[PDB]
């Protein structure tokens, strides 16, 4: 039960390898479409760049923009992590129906993008928004 909705984890397989994600909702039982212990996650595809005392608000905002992704990932391809990230905006928005409905997939991706904007700007989960150097 270390993989719960709201736990931060790392992806080790696939295109988004080495990226930090938050478990949106766990399907540990499995599904007909995914006959394994998969879990939908939202992660940061492009981490925001570092900022400084200098640079105008334009450059700071330009470097603070974040590109997210949403993906169904196997448990064996996820690496769990002790840090936990939670927000009520990202509870229950994702499901199988969202993945089949591509407009909902894009809408959920944009909602995850926005939610990461306020979270980064507010300075929460600085580790989650820091890229991992491997």
């Amino acid at each position: 039960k270390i993989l719960k909705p709201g736990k931060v984890a790392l992806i080790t397989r696939g295109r988004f390898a080495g990226k930090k994600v938050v478990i949106l909702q766990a399907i540990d039982q499995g599904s007909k479409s995914h006959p394994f212990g998969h879990a939908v996650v939202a992660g940061v595809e492009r981490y925001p760049l570092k900022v400084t005392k200098s640079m105008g608000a334009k450059r700071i905002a330009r470097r603070s923009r974040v590109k997210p992704f949403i993906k169904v990932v196997n448990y064996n391809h996820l690496m769990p992590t002790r840090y936990a990230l939670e927000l009520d905006n990202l509870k229950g928005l994702i499901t199988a129906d969202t993945f089949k409905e591509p407009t909902q997939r894009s809408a959920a991706r944009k909602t995850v993008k926005k939610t990461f904007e306020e979270k980064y700007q507010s300075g929460k989960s600085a580790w989650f928004f820091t890229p991992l150097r491997f």
Binding site: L10, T12, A17, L132, F134
Partner: peptide
């Protein structure tokens, strides 16, 4: 299309990722 794609194998990249995170912990 993966980190170190065209430089490291998939298992090598996975070991890089896990080892980096664990030692940072």
């Amino acid at each position: 299309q993966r980190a170190y794609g065209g430089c490291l194998s998939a298992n090598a990249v996975k070991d890089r990722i896990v080892r980096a995170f664990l030692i940072e912990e």
